[PDB]
Amino acid sequence: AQGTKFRISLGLPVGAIMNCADNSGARNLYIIAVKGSGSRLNRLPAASLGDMVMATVKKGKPELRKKVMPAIVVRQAKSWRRRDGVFLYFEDNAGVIANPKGEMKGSAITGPVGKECADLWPRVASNSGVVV
């Protein structure tokens, strides 16, 4: 994919449970696999910010529940390295559901997004309030 432009240590593995950053109706997501990156650590597949991941909906509205959908990791607890050298870490781990095409709706994110991510998925960026 396009260079993220920052160094990332994958915070999440398959099976990790994470917050769903949007108003799709899905509260929490389970990461099944990492698709838009490829399985990076492969034996225990790992995903981090900027990766596109396949997920299943653990918690949310019944319509959403158990749906298998694609998503993008917006934030993670484990730190990142900026070119400048500063490391950035977030409060929690979260992802936003995205479509097959690669769009968000792109109601809002709520919350800030990494510039690295916005660059990779412009449409998602096109709906971010702030990008850090």
Partner: protein, 56 residues
């Protein structure tokens, strides 16, 4: 921009270092060092602290 001032104490920050805090509403706080950040986390205000340049 060429010169950087600590958004906390007010002292100059040596270039190539310091940390930047992201507010989430995209506000920015540039901290010269951990001590300042620690105080801020404390929820103290720099004006209150005598040692700070801002206060003095």
């Amino acid at each position: 921009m060429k010169v950087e001032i600590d958004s906390f104490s007010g002292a100059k920050i040596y270039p190539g270092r310091g940390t930047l805090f992201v507010r989430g509403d995209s506000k920015i706080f540039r901290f010269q060092n951990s001590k300042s950040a620690s105080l801020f986390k404390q929820r103290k205000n720099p004006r209150r602290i005598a040692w700070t340049v801002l206060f003095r």
